[PDB]
Amino acid sequence: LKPNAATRDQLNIIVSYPPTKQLTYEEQDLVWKFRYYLTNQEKALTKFLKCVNWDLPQEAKQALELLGKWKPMDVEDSLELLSSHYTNPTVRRYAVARLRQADDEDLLMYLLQLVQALKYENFDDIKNGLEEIDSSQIITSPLPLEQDLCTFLISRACKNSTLANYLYWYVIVECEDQDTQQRDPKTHEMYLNVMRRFSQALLKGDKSVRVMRSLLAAQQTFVDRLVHLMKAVQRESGNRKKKNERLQALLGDNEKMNLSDVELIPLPLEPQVKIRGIIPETATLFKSALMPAQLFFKTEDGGKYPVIFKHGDDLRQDQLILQIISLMDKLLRKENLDLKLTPYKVLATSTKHGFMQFIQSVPVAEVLDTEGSIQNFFRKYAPSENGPNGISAEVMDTYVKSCAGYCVITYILGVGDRHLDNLLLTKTGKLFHIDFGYILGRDPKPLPPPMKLNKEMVEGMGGTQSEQYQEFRKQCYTAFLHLRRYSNLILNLFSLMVDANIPDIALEPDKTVKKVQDKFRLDLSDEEAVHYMQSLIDESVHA
Numbered sequence: 001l002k003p004n005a006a007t008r009d010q011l012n013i014i015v016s017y018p019p020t021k022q023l024t025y026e027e028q029d030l031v032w033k034f035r036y037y038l039t040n041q042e043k044a045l046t047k048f049l050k051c052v053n054w055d056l057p058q059e060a061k062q063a064l065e066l067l068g069k070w071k072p073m074d075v076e077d078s079l080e081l082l083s084s085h086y087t088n089p090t091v092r093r094y095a096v097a098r099l100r101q102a103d104d105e106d107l108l109m110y111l112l113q114l115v116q117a118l119k120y121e122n123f124d125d126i127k128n129g130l131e132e133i134d135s136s137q138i139i140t141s142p143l144p145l146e147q148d149l150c151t152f153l154i155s156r157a158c159k160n161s162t163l164a165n166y167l168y169w170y171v172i173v174e175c176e177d178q179d180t181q182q183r184d185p186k187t188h189e190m191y192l193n194v195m196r197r198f199s200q201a202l203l204k205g206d207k208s209v210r211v212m213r214s215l216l217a218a219q220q221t222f223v224d225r226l227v228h229l230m231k232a233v234q235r236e237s238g239n240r241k242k243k244n245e246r247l248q249a250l251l252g253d254n255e256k257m258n259l260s261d262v263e264l265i266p267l268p269l270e271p272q273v274k275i276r277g278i279i280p281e282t283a284t285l286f287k288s289a290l291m292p293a294q295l296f297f298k299t300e301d302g303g304k305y306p307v308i309f310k311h312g313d314d315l316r317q318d319q320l321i322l323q324i325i326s327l328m329d330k331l332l333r334k335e336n337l338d339l340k341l342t343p344y345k346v347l348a349t350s351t352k353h354g355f356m357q358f359i360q361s362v363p364v365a366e367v368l369d370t371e372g373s374i375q376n377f378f379r380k381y382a383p384s385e386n387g388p389n390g391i392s393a394e395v396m397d398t399y400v401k402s403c404a405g406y407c408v409i410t411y412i413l414g415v416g417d418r419h420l421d422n423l424l425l426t427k428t429g430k431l432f433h434i435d436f437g438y439i440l441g442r443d444p445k446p447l448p449p450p451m452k453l454n455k456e457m458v459e460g461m462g463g464t465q466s467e468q469y470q471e472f473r474k475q476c477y478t479a480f481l482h483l484r485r486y487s488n489l490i491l492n493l494f495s496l497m498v499d500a501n502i503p504d505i506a507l508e509p510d511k512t513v514k515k516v517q518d519k520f521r522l523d524l525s526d527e528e529a530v531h532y533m534q535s536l537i538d539e540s541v542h543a
């Protein structure tokens, strides 16, 4: 059945929709009517499967015939199929089948999301792969369209130690989730079962695979002791100076604790890095009443890898935000735009605790209290006689680019609660944000601005009249156009976090993807979208 040119155009309009537009009944009947003609368009499948009422068995059987005939879909479109809209096991098996096609570098960037996608999988299939229960005991307690998702994730994790590490911790944290346990116990089991299947699949494996399981256990052991240590510190009476002496005391006793000297284990935060232990003498606590701890790991090479370990806090929102920023930055760099971003690593070792890579830097606030100005600061540490305003070209260039990158990205992610506390600067010129407590348009104060600039950022570029500021403008709109090309991917990825119990998403799960989708101004053309960003910057700077 071949549609006439007038409708072919109408079909094209429909397929051009954001994966998050809800098609009308008229619109579905039309896409359904010409489903066979649409088979050509990889792009059209997703909208086709939106046209099906999966509760009608014959309609599902019918749809599934086509799936097997359709131009096969992209990787980025497959993440649409693993969301909650789709319970149909054949569909979800079709999605996994096209994710197989992706490289592990790419899987990693969506893995946080895919672990959530487990929630929509078939719990009976998962459990019957096996051959009250503390999730963290499982690895430490070893017994002496064909694939679903669980099988696939484990199969790939068995071949790739980096992937396995994240799979392991992402699932632990899903197991640890108190809310899921009370409100969806069956889901809690599904995750226990996944961990047990992972544990099981490792032990079945060859020499190298089995060692991966020892490693994962050693890490979980490591973290259990760190946690215990932190509790001891957080109960210690008296001033912070006194509470530091306890943290250092305990790290240093390897009999009791085992934390200063160990056989090389992957760092859970960045498992490419392996670590001999924590250096006791330099451990300290931040001022915060939560008492997160700064801690220098000795790496394999005798380098230092400082982290923050937070105990009593849920890092999952922050984890997500840095996972996204990381992906945004990979994408930009694929399109040859390296904005000197600081996608620092975040990893939750539980709902109650986790790690953060600690980047050597100075809060802009401190920069003010010590050197008066971002430019003065740069003239102290990165002086040049030839360079702009007394400052090394490279340093200013880095600063302009990163200023632009965050400006866009923090706008797109509606990151609020911004202060000179959260805004950090690097003697190499790198500017970056931290502490993502409020996102997607929340803020402690009312009427938050949509663009997150300030007098101090602008001044360090040399005011609105400088060559730098023009380059800033230019890098923003350019970054905005690049990120718009990936709106599909980014939107699918947030779309998989609706049940993830991320505070700012769990207010209005139903309504969060649109919050992000609106920032992209997908209604505007690229050229119009450039003038939108320039407007935005103008308003902001005028206030």
Ligand SMILES: CC(C)OCCN1c2nc(N3CCOCC3)cc(=O)n2CC[C@H]1C(F)(F)F
Pocket (backbone or CB within 6 Å): 286, 288, 292, 308, 318, 344, 356, 357, 358, 359, 360, 361, 363, 421, 424, 434, 435, 436
């Ligand atoms: C330096 C100090 C003022 O900053 C506050 C430290 N700090 C913090 N540092 C982060 N950085 C990660 C990236 O490298 C830099 C540090 C990330 C982050 O989320 N936070 C949250 C608030 C406080 C703390 F201590 F309570 F956790």
